[PDB]
Amino acid sequence: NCNTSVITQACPKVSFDPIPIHYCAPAGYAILKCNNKTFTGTGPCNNVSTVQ
Amino acid sequence: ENLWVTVYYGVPVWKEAKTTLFCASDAKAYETHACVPTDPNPQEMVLKNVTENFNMWKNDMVDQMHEDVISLWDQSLKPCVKLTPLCVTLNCTNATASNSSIIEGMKNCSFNITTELRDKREKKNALFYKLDIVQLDGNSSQYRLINCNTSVITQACPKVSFDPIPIHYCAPAGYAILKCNNKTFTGTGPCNNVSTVQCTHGIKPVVSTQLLLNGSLAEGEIIIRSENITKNVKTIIVHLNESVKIECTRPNNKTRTSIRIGPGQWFYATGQVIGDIREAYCNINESKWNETLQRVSKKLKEYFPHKNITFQPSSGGDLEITTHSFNCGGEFFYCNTSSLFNRTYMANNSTRTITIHCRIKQIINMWQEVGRAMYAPPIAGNITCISNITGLLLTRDYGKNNTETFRPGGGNMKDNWRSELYKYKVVKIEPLGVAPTRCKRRV
């Protein structure tokens, strides 16, 4: 890759790894979830729900 | 008798102040300026019996624009590749064409430089204009880039070219903008046709000297504005209404050639030259220009009741002021203007074309700073741009005897924007007040 770009080395004392991340809506916004277990990923739901 | 306090709310009234302003961009954007804030629908309302004063020499937003433009330029150019490794000794025999004296940079200078595999050097060659080169001491065959003894040189990103997209400002919540519309206003004093708007109209960040071009035009007849603390003014602005057209061209065909600097960023230059060699030039209609000058002279005498008036070309300084400077297409120009100002006067429709011969150089400096020279890549082919002028910048010598004289200047980039934001003055509203009345509670 040196014909085209510079190369950077991971810092030896550091290693990013899959720490879970979850999102919280800001004040005034609300999140809807849906829970029907046959949902195709598009279309209406009939077991709507809301979460923090 | 027995009048008691009533406290009204929101009443219209304002006071002087200064505050940061939002900047809005056109919908079909450039592809804080690039995409947003969005473009509103402008409005303007006229008001009766509104009394207010203006001062075009003190108004705040003039200063702000200076920061905005430079900050935008730096934000745009910051990541582009530096040219530091290119700055080394050059060998410039350069006599390989039937005519070279016009440019003196030729193919076939040559210099050692690094290449892809780093640890082995290579030899190349390209063109330059002697105005971008200087000679070292003793050996007249060695040359150095002009600004490298003092600074680093940055290259405009080849896929990018900022250009005069208009920008207009909107006051933030709580402040209001006043405009004035009297057509004989000198730029300082009271107005009697005050007005208020959502936002200002378009303004372009155009850069030029000895005259301002591609800008808007005046409404009434020509106007002259200046400070009035003392006759010994710095810069007098003259504002036109009659637009005088101008054209310029760069006939030769430039050939683009390139080198690439491992770690993998490309560098551009000028290579082969195609076509017969000629010098760049421009054209003007003598009738229109001399008529405009006549009108200016017959307005100019108002502040100078009885002395003779005579024009003469600028004197001294770097090329940024001895000549006209403007850019079309993506390359810069410098044009001697002695012929266009050698005139005189005293108290009491396309024939006769005039031509002026110019030069173009590559390396540029932001018109005040040091240490930040910009380098532009050559444009292949030929460039031609129509254009029109709208005003002039005049400074005056020591008045002697029965004669007075003006000469063209304007190297300070502040004045250019001073000539298109003379309108607006920004103020804050004070929505609270008091008054007496007689109402009683009756609880």
Next chain:
Amino acid sequence: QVRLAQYGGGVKRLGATMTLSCVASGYTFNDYYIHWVRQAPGQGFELLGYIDPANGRPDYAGALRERLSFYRDKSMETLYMDLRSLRYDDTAMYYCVRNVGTAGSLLHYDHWG
């Protein structure tokens, strides 16, 4: 705090070219003008001309436009003056003065050199 020092000068031969110089101090080089003023012994002053450091514009008194010359070099905050064909009546002191100024007008001098 702000200083303006001079070099050169000394004796010169009649009819010869001569030089002077000012070196600026760290106030700011792009925000002020510069003037040259000279004083014959036992005589009132007079002014020569003023050179802006920004772009290099000169402007000369009406009595000397053939002989004087200015130019600057912002790289080291320096200003050079050339005076050609000295005459006997030019013997005098030479100063080097700053000049406050607004965006639209000039005013007094403050820090003589």
Next chain:
Amino acid sequence: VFLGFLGAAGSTMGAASMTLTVQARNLLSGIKQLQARVLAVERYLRDQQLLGIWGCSGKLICCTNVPWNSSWSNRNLSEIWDNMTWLQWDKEISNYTQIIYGLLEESQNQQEKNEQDLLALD
């Protein structure tokens, strides 16, 4: 929603007061632009809380019990009310305005002294 902003300016104070309600809605719409909005909301919230002291939070027009006096200059004003228009009035009285707030606080406080015994039970 924007029209006639500052429109009634220059008119008689009477009619001027008839047009106040529109402009009460004036909260419409480098990398330093976030500060502007905060300043606007801060200064608006300053006044829309200061008016909570003089007993006029829900009243774009309000009286309260403190008598006028001539130490703040004096005018007939039964006819100048329709002549001087607002801007002139502001400059006329501004010199004493900062004093007036002190009067309002004291009167409101002595009102609240009586209020203390008169607010809620079963």
Next chain:
Amino acid sequence: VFLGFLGAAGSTMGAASMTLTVQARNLLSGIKQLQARVLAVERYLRDQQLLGIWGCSGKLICCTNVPWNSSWSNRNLSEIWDNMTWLQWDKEISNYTQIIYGLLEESQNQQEKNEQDLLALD
């Protein structure tokens, strides 16, 4: 403090109104976080000040003197008050809401005009 948020949604408008007060408390708080927070404050204040204009900031339920009319469509609604829950009502009348505010402004303003003469003295 958080519970039952959006809980009553879908119920009859009658009972739904009985549960309003809980959600009125919904106001809290890379490098873009600061912009989201200030957006909440701006959003809240904008809609809060409007109820100040319409003389209703002191109540979560309010009225004002402007009569309904059929130009905004018309229904019995003494039975639709229970059938349509709330979500449907929004899409049923939203097309005219921006018109409705104009009626409120003038009515409240003339109310205050009448009040102008009856507020405070000795």
Next chain:
Amino acid sequence: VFLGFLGAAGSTMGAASMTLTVQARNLLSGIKQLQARVLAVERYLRDQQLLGIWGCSGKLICCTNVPWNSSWSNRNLSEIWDNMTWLQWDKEISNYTQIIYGLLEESQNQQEKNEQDLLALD
């Protein structure tokens, strides 16, 4: 404007209550300096909204209709009101304060429900 801030602290609660306006006026205002100001603004708004819920937006001193009870500890307080000064009272009752708000929620809600039948008409 700044003077006597926190001045009356430590005195009798009675007189202390006679000095609230002095400290009611306290709204004001590295490179992340904007963070603190927004915190103050939102803190003020949060602690203000509750006094809008309990029907006390325009009353620095307010009552409401909920009886006191001894489950929160009890004192004679007809004389300790002038003795313990305020700081001690805070720690005395703080343990139960968060419960109290629940009582207040229904207090204004039932009043508003009752008034629902009379809010505005011709």
